[PDB]
Amino acid sequence: MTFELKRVALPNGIHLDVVDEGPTDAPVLIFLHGFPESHRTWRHQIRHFSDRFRCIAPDQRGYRGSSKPQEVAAYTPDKLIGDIFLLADTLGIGSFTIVGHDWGGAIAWGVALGGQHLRVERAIIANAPHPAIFQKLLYTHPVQREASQYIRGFRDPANDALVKEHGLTGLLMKEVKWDRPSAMEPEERDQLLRDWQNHDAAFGMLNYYRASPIDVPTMDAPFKVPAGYTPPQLPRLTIPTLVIWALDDLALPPENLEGLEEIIDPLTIVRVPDCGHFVPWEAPDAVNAAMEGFLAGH
């Protein structure tokens, strides 16, 4: 399966290749993939909703044919969040629902929190931790700290020799702490294996972790918030928000949902039992069902 991509030049000097399907003046859903995927992550939802919604899905910075600057700092969270507002600007989209999975969901939380009521009318987040919650969990909760040890591997510049020899695939093969995808259609797998052979993309994709200010301690460090840690002041999220959470995601255990109710209103949580990390395509019918109910005009 293939979507037509268009190249969108942005005023920060980046271009993004993007899916743009559906009626031009329909309500907009902007879909953000995570690592190590592509605009294809939300394929099932894009095809499901593009009869009624304008569906935008970029290959984000660092991915596939989009700009792949090699410097780590080109991937700081502000830049990744900024790319989405600039993409909406360039396409003439005043307000949209932001939809994100994994890194796309982390970016989506930022987009929603910053842009709510001005640019962002609803948020849909699937298996991506909330920035008010995640850093604290890494400090306090062994389940989460253990779950996130792969990030330390992805950050280790001693692994770059392996990426240069074997593409991203070599590091994914080597990094046993990384939670691997479940069974996917052969055509989808083939595309990713081809994508992962591009050196510049492999590093751009890894740079999300390398540029992130998130602190993932070793399992040796005390399970307490450091004395000098100041929790970023965030606003509450006061746009309609759907959080979808596959319960067998080994990277992002369900503890990530604790505390969401206090900081989001109106919040809907849809737990997906017996499903791993890649929920948009591992459980597309549950995801489509959740989105249908949530997006309904009543």
Numbering used by the authors: 1 to 298
Could you pull the original sentences from the published paper?
Epoxide hydrolases (EHs, EC 3.3.2.9) are enzymes that catalyze the in vivo hydrolysis of an epoxide ring to the corresponding vicinal diols. Two novel EH enzymes of the α/β fold class have been identified from metagenomic samples from diverse locations in Russia and China. The nucleophile Asp102 in Sibe-EH (Asp101 in CH65-EH), is complemented by His277 and Asp249 (His270 and Asp241) to form a catalytic triad.
Sibe-EH is monomeric in the crystal structure and in solution which is similar to many other bacterial EHs and plant, such as potato, EHs. All residues of Sibe-EH plus one His residue belonging to the C-terminal His tag have been modeled into the electron density.
